[PDB]
Amino acid sequence: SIPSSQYGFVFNKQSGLKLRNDLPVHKPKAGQLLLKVDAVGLCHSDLHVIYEGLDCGDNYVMGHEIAGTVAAVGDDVINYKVGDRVACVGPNGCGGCKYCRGAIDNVCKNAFGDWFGLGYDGGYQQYLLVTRPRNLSRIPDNVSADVAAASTDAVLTPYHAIKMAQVSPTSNILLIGAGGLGGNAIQVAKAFGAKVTVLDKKKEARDQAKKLGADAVYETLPESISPGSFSACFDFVSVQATFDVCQKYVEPKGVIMPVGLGAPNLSFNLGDLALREIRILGSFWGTTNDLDDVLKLVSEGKVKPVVRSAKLKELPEYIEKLRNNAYEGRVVFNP
Amino acid sequence: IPSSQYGFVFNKQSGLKLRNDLPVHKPKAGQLLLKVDAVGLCHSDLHVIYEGLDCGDNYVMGHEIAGTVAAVGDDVINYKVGDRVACVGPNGCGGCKYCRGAIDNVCKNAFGDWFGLGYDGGYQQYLLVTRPRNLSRIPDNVSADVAAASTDAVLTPYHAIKMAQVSPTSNILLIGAGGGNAIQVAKAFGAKVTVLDKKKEARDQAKKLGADAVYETLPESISPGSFSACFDFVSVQATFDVCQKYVEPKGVIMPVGLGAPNLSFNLGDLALREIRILGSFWGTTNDLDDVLKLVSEGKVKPVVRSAKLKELPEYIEKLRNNAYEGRVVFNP
Amino acid sequence: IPSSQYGFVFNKQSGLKLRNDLPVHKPKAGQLLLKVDAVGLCHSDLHVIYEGLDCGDNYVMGHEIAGTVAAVGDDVINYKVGDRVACVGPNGCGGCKYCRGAIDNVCKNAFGDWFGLGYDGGYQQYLLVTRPRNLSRIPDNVSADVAAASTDAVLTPYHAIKMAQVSPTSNILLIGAGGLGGNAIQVAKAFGAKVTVLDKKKEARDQAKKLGADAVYETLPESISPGSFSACFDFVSVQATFDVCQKYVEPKGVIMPVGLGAPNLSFNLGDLALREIRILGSFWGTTNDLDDVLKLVSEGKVKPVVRSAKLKELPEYIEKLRNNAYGRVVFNP
Amino acid sequence: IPSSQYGFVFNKQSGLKLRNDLPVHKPKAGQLLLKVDAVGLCHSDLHVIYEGLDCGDNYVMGHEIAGTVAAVGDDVINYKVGDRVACVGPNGCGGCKYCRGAIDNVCKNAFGDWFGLGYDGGYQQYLLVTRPRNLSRIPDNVSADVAAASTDAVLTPYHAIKMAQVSPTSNILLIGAGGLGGNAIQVAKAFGAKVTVLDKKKEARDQAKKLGADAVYETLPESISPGSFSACFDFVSVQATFDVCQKYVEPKGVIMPVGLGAPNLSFNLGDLALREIRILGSFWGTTNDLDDVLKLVSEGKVKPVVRSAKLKELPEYIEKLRNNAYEGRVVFNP
Ligand SMILES: OC[C@H](O)c1ccccc1
Ligand SMILES: OC[C@H](O)c1ccccc1
Ligand SMILES: OC[C@H](O)c1ccccc1
Ligand SMILES: OC[C@H](O)c1ccccc1
Ligand SMILES: [Zn+2]
Ligand SMILES: [Zn+2]
Ligand SMILES: [Zn+2]
Ligand SMILES: [Zn+2]
Ligand SMILES: [Zn+2]
Ligand SMILES: [Zn+2]
Ligand SMILES: [Zn+2]
Ligand SMILES: [Zn+2]
């Protein structure tokens, strides 16, 4: 059954992203595993590499939102067996440095340039070689491959940030801008049982937020909202104007989470941040264990990743759409 | 216990002026009167006097206070006359979630009502303490001069170090620490300390204070993103960029200086390497107890100079001109 | 503004007796007089009356208080006549390192001075509050009865669940759910954690499941993998139930012996060390906790179920509780 | 290099035996071959050899390894031939939530596969390290002997002390400064805590004073107020000593039962709950802990006393240790 050749989309600084019908199907070494891709997602991050000069390496199959079934396992591999359904952990940490093993494999220096679909081969192919089974998460039986894949980033990232902020049933948080992880952030936040107030200019966003379970929805925060009264602020747009709002409404000892691509630099009022001991925390993707938590929240139905499916050979057709106007959520491709 | 007293009152107009007819209030129920023995001075005062740092108006300055309880009011059994105590600058209310949440230093109700910074301070003879909870017993082997200095010079950096969770395995960077008990405190936690300061004088001082490595410029070998924590005591865009540059992934940046009113950080870098910027303000009441205990045990030895309170005007000018180094306390 | 009142006072000699000549203390500076609107009852009271539990002597009982500020002595700035508040059991001094360290529930100076357990409580018409810092404003949408019922039934388990750092990804085990933390399940459910209940009484199991429990058992089936729970709350705290916790708690997990069981409990040293298990003691709750608790109730996260009756009927209910489970009954002075 | 080597293999039926025909494994990929420079010995080995402690069967013993990378398999880039590294006992799998959660010392999959305790150890010339993640680089100023002597004697107490969150403002009580309790004083000192030691042995007390202990007692004096210690580390862990901890630990304080005194221990429930005392279990140490340990040793904040000897002398040292004879930490060079 297992072929010796396969098709996939390999990225190259020259020809860009093109289809390859003569790609090899690597046989796993002792300690490695071969994953048969079932669902692979697409998002703006891929656009950065293909058009915004974001260099994550060269000559590698793209697709960082993987979900599939183990096709073959090398000897010594006892934690996984053929048939096991798992989702890939993007950062793909080395698992040996102090960062990995330190519970933060998402900021691994050695894995830099070796992330799934972003430096190292990804899911835009039929069979992916997993050099380090450590960066995988078992997919619950009630969770489909399309959903799982749609959680590897659209849910994992916001989840990581939410947990980093130590949100609880007593948390009073503010979210700036829905859509683009903002939506899934609403669900995740509410999963911790926290009160959620949302701010967004776009019309749809608010209606969507209100639908997702947002306790508060505004196009502009009223005056009845006392400044410095929110325990946590997540800025999904991350622009000076929006960052200023966070610092204004974040309560003393509170936290500001700039999780947007707004501007390259952002300034903060030192006097205020110092006197009220405000804290700015950086957040990137998610950790391996975080993915296990996310898949559990999805399995429990606490987070509903909304996505549509299509065959992988339609990727080019969808990459163009995302470049112009995009849609509302994500689309996973079936190899 | 006279009926009147002298002291220095600050006004956004008249500025800091000597007042020879200030009233001496008697402690009410739950209150206490403090006989100021030593009151310190630092740059924080200059920012309020000349650099427009509104903390209130028409209040006696001096936020570094050390004194002796001259009188107590009924319903006060915690303290008794003769007791030597130091004031907890923040002067929290004690009745909010912050104060009862172990962080009375960020008390909202007390904002702008700090000792010598909104509320009456130590630049006088007698200070009425409306909230004695914001006091710390001064160890017998700790003089008033040292205690007064420790209320800020030691308390602030201590609170920042503990907040950063520094340990004996921490590899930290201090910028402009020589210009100062921060180094001793850090070493008290057993952390490896590297000091970056341009002035040779400050460097020698740091080396003397136990610094493990002092530099005017970080040499090669000290790769970027290698420090677990970076404390900026100058807090200027140039110095902050150094911290973000040399702080390791998931490391912390503590902008503990009175530099620029605003600072910018690279969003991409901070997010990618999960760098965290933590604001730190003065210290809590519990921190002041810890600090005095550390000073008493000699873990931290503040260098203090003394003089009469009526000489304050002179040292103010000398300080703003950078005429002297080290801390100087005053005795009323 | 009566100068006299009635109430139930406890005494190691004559137990809990009704008094109709009790005085109505007038608040001094910093003090405050509270008019009791509702006061709860729980087994904790039985231990002090029928089981030599010494929390002091000669004092009005009732430690689940909820009332309205009737009078405030001078200097009182935070509260004033009309304010609806609930009492914080521990009644910390607010001056020690523990109190101003965010743990006023373990105040040493307050030992034996807890509301209704050392110091006068709520089983009266007017309670004198020596330290008004130990009060929590009652939200507008929360009745006096519900609030009173939250001063212990919800507060205690909340504090423990919060201490265990339970999250929506937690897999906890609760031993005892028949009044023994009936609200614990709801509290845990509020944090989004999965809750498995173990109780020998069918009544408790039906109740547990109705309360939100994801799984209920009279005896954990062998099919349940040992050391698979992140946290275990023992509300009965007997050697047998503790051994269940240590066996099913996962490595680096926590055991919360929050029951009034045996005076002593033993753990297997080799196991605790090897799998790095941790046993955390938990007591009542802090002032900040009560604020969070009352906020959770106000938001609907926790819905305490309580029955009310006149304070005069206290003795009648104390017997009921000594013979069954239906406890969780507020009284109105 | 050699096509064969010698080493001491343990078998439930034959016991610990010298083997001159041991094979030298070739690292597949992601693995490496470690030439053992120094391997320590402690009482833990005796429990396996004579006290029936079952950690597995048919494996080279020696769980305190220090060596040099002799060869690396393909795909191995973090390490290269010549690197000096120490082994992390637990040898976690590195794939479960425990290992990925910063606590590889309690890995379930790895239980029964610890270096020298289930899996092959250091009592040989060349050790095949299956999971390189469980290694800690040895600072250039730290000898192999000292490093090996830190893999347990220092790592274990360090992990426990770190877990209790000791700080420059801590006031701790240490019961039993006989074995690992010795380096425990140096480690606690490194964190800046005040240390009060309680030990019945005279020599132990004298050692405590030398190691910088602030207070050393044969019996705690009446001047010591009950519930005044922020943390209590009990190295003997007997009911009598545990009661001491529960009596002298302050509210919210922590009791660390790091001994083998008894199979069970009881605590006063009322006391524990009312004052919120916490009992924390501690086992060996993590991989990152070893990094910290080697740094503390490298800086000279912890100085483990060690004497070396040829590996083929192990049998004699075992018997002597088995009788308390030499007593002093001893490492062997293959
Ligand atoms: O959470 C990670 C995100 O998908 C991302 C990955 C690579 C580059 C930019 C952004
Ligand atoms: O953190 C203590 C310092 O004295 C200070 C207090 C108020 C304003 C600026 C600086
Ligand atoms: O923690 C609350 C409970 O009412 C209780 C208080 C004191 C003693 C035993 C039990
Ligand atoms: O710190 C661990 C200790 O060496 C030990 C290991 C295995 C068995 C008993 C004790
Ligand atoms: Zn993506
Ligand atoms: Zn790594
Ligand atoms: Zn100052
Ligand atoms: Zn306050
Ligand atoms: Zn009760
Ligand atoms: Zn107290
Ligand atoms: Zn050993
Ligand atoms: Zn593992």
**DSSP designation for C235:** S
Q: Which residues of A touch B256 (CB under 8 A)?
A: 274
Ligand 7 centroid – CA B42 distance (Å): 5
In which element (H, E) is residue B70 found?
strand B64-72
In a 3-state reduction of DSSP, which class is residue A180?
Answer: coil
Q: Which residues of B touch A276 (CB under 8 A)?
A: 106, 279, 281
Known binding residues of D for Zn(2+) are 42, 63-64, 93, 96, 99, 107, 152
Known binding residues of C for Zn(2+) are 42, 63-64, 93, 96, 99, 107, 152
Q: D1-154+285-334: which CATH number, 3.90.180.10, 3.30.420.10, 3.40.50.2300, 3.40.190.10? A: 3.90.180.10
Strands D114-115 and D32-41: unpaired
Q: Which residues of A touch D100 (CB under 8 A)?
A: 100-101, 103, 105, 134, 287-289
CB contact under 8 A, D102 and A105: no
| Number of other residues whose CB lies within 10 A of the CB of residue A183 | 27
Whether residue A56 is annotated as binding a ligand: the answer is: no
Where do you find CATH 3.90.180.10 in chain C?
Answer: 1-154+285-333
Q: What phi and psi, each to the nearest 5 degrees, are found at residue D14?
A: -95, -20
Distance separating alpha carbons of residues B201 and B212, to the nearest angstrom: 16
A167: left (phi over 0), alpha (psi -120 to 50) or beta: beta
Neighbours of ion ligand 10 (CB under 5 A): C 92-93, 96, 99, 107
Where do you find CATH 3.90.180.10 in chain A?
Answer: 1-155+286-335
Distance separating alpha carbons of residues A290 and A162, to the nearest angstrom: 11
Ligand 10 centroid – CA C96 distance (Å): 4
Whether residue A94 is annotated as binding a ligand: the answer is: yes
Dihedral Cα B245, B249, B255, B261, nearest 10 deg:
70
Q: Which experimental approach was used here?
A: X-ray
Q: What phi and psi, each to the nearest 5 degrees, are found at residue C52?
A: 40, 20
Distance separating alpha carbons of residues D205 and D223, to the nearest angstrom: 19
Sequence length of chain D is 334
How is domain A1-155+286-335 classified at the architecture level of CATH? Alpha-Beta Complex (3.90)
Distance separating alpha carbons of residues D185 and D208, to the nearest angstrom: 7
Whether residue B179 is annotated as binding a ligand: the answer is: yes
Whether residue B55 is annotated as binding a ligand: the answer is: no
Residue nearest to atom 2 of ligand 4 (CA): D284
Q: For residue B9, list its beta bridge partners.
A: B17, B60
Distance separating alpha carbons of residues D175 and D163, to the nearest angstrom: 17
Size of interface A-C (CB pairs under 8 A): 28
Q: Could you tell which of D47, D91, D158 is best to mutate to test the pocket of ligand 4, judged by most ligand atoms within 8 Å of the CB? A: D47
Distance separating alpha carbons of residues D303 and D183, to the nearest angstrom: 8
Alpha helices (H) in B164-321, listed in sequence order: 182-188, 200-208, 237-246, 267-272, 285-296, 312-320
Whether residue B197 is annotated as binding a ligand: the answer is: yes
In a 3-state reduction of DSSP, which class is residue B31?
Answer: coil
Please state, in angstroms and as integers, the Cα–Cα distance from residue B253 to each residue in A279, B193, B237, C275, following that order. Answer: 10, 15, 13, 35
Ligand 4 centroid – CA D119 distance (Å): 14
Q: Which residues of B touch D299 (CB under 8 A)?
A: 192
- For residues A259-270, one letter each, b for 16 or more C-beta atoms within 10 angstroms of the residue's C-beta and e for the rest, the string is bbbbbeebbbbb
Residue nearest to atom 2 of ligand 2 (CA): B282
- Residue of chain A whose alpha carbon sits nearest to that of B235: A270
Distance separating alpha carbons of residues A333 and A309, to the nearest angstrom: 6
Residue nearest to atom 10 of ligand 2 (CA): B44
Q: Which residues of A touch B272 (CB under 8 A)?
A: 107, 282, 284
Q: Which of D167, D260, D279, D284 to mutate to test the interface with C (most CBs of C within 10 A)?
A: D279
Neighbouring chains of A at 3+ CB pairs within 8 Å?
B, C, D
Structural contact between residues C301 and D294, judged by C-beta atoms closer than 8 angstroms = no
Ligand 7 centroid – CA B192 distance (Å): 26
DSSP of A279-330: EEE---S--HHHHHHHHHHHHTTSS---EEEEEGGGHHHHHHHHHHT--SSE
Letter for the amino acid at C101? Answer: G
Q: Could you tell which of D49, D54, D63, D105 is best to mutate to test the pocket of ligand 4, judged by most ligand atoms within 8 Å of the CB? A: D63
Q: C1-154+285-333: which CATH number, 3.40.50.300, 3.90.180.10, 3.40.710.10, 3.40.50.2300? A: 3.90.180.10
- Residue of chain D whose alpha carbon sits nearest to that of C243: D264
CB contact under 8 A, A268 and B277: yes
Ligand 1 centroid – CA D22 distance (Å): 50
Contacts of A145 (CB under 8 A, 6+ apart): A38, A39, A67, A68, A69, A85, A139, A332, A334
Q: HSE-up of B8 (CA within 13 Å, CB side)? A: 22
Ligand 10 centroid – CA B76 distance (Å): 15
What are the tokens at B1? 């216990």
Distance separating alpha carbons of residues B151 and B42, to the nearest angstrom: 11
Neighbouring chains of D at 3+ CB pairs within 8 Å?
A, B, C
In a 3-state reduction of DSSP, which class is residue A36?
Answer: strand
DSSP of B266-298: EHHHHHHTT-EEE---S--HHHHHHHHHHHHTT
| Number of other residues whose CB lies within 10 A of the CB of residue D35 | 18
CB contact under 8 A, C167 and A193: no
Ligand 8 centroid – CA C72 distance (Å): 20
Distance separating alpha carbons of residues B54 and B112, to the nearest angstrom: 8
Where do you find CATH 3.40.50.720 in chain D?
Answer: 155-284
Q: Which of B106, B256, B274 sits opposite A282 (nearest CB)?
A: B274
What are the tokens at D18? 């010298």
Distance separating alpha carbons of residues B170 and B156, to the nearest angstrom: 19
Structural contact between residues A232 and A209, judged by C-beta atoms closer than 8 angstroms = no
Topology of the domain covering B1-154+283-332:
Quinone Oxidoreductase; Chain A, domain 1 (3.90.180)
CB contact under 8 A, B278 and A276: no
What are the tokens at D278? 């916490």
Largest CA distance in chain B: 65
What are the tokens at D85? 């590294």
Closest ligand 1 atom to A286 CA: 1
Ligand 5 centroid – CA C166 distance (Å): 30
| CATH class of the A156-285 domain in this structure | alpha beta
In a 3-state reduction of DSSP, which class is residue B160?
Answer: helix
CB contact under 8 A, B271 and A283: yes
Q: For residue D172, list its beta bridge partners.
A: D195, D231
Contacts of B202 (CB under 8 A, 6+ apart): B176, B177, B178, B179, B195
Contacts of D206 (CB under 8 A, 6+ apart): none
Distance separating alpha carbons of residues D252 and D267, to the nearest angstrom: 15
- SS3 string of chain D? CCCCEEEEEEECCCEEEEEEEECCCCCCECCEEEEEEEEEECHHHHHHHCCCCCCCCCEECCCCEEEEEEEECECCCCCCCCCEEEECCCCCCCCCCCCCCCCHHHCCCCCCCEECEEECCCCECEEEECCHHHEEECCCCCCHHHHHCCCCCCHHHHHHHHHCCCCCCCEEEEECCCCCHHHHHHHHHHCCCEEEEECCCHHHHHHHHHCCCCEEECCCCCCCCCCCEEEEEECCCCHHHHHHHHHHEEEEEEEEECCCCCCEEEEEHHHHHHCCCEEECCCCCCHHHHHHHHHHHHHCCCCCCCEEEEHHHHHHHHHHHCCCCCCCCEEEEC
What are the tokens at B278? 């933590």
Report the CATH number of the C155-284 domain. Answer: 3.40.50.720
Q: For residue B306, list its beta bridge partners.
A: B329
Q: Could you tell which of A45, A62, A151 is best to mutate to test the pocket of ligand 1, judged by most ligand atoms within 8 Å of the CB? A: A45
Q: Which of B250, B269, B273, B282 to mutate to test the interface with A (most CBs of A within 10 A)?
A: B250
In a 3-state reduction of DSSP, which class is residue A333?
Answer: strand
Q: HSE-up of B276 (CA within 13 Å, CB side)? A: 24
Q: Which residues of C touch D105 (CB under 8 A)?
A: 276
Contacts of D231 (CB under 8 A, 6+ apart): D164, D166, D170, D172, D173, D193, D249, D253, D254, D255, D256
Query: Ligand 2: which residues within 6 Å by Cβ?
Result: B 44, 63, 117, 152, 156, 281-282
**Closest ligand relative to D117 C-alpha:** 4
Over its C-alpha atoms, chain A yields an Rg (Å, rounded) of 20
Q: Which residues of A touch C190 (CB under 8 A)?
A: 169, 193
CB contact under 8 A, B281 and A262: no
* Interface residues from chain B to D (CB-CB < 8 Å): 162, 167-169, 188-190, 192, 290, 293-294, 299
Q: HSE-up of A200 (CA within 13 Å, CB side)? A: 25
Contacts of B117 (CB under 8 A, 6+ apart): B44, B48, B55, B56, B59, B61, B63, B89
| Number of other residues whose CB lies within 10 A of the CB of residue C122 | 32
Distance separating alpha carbons of residues A300 and B29, to the nearest angstrom: 58
Q: Which of C95, C102, C104 sits opposite B78 (nearest CB)?
A: C95
Topology of the domain covering B155-282:
Rossmann fold (3.40.50)
Structural contact between residues B158 and B68, judged by C-beta atoms closer than 8 angstroms = no
Q: Which residues of B touch A281 (CB under 8 A)?
A: 274, 276
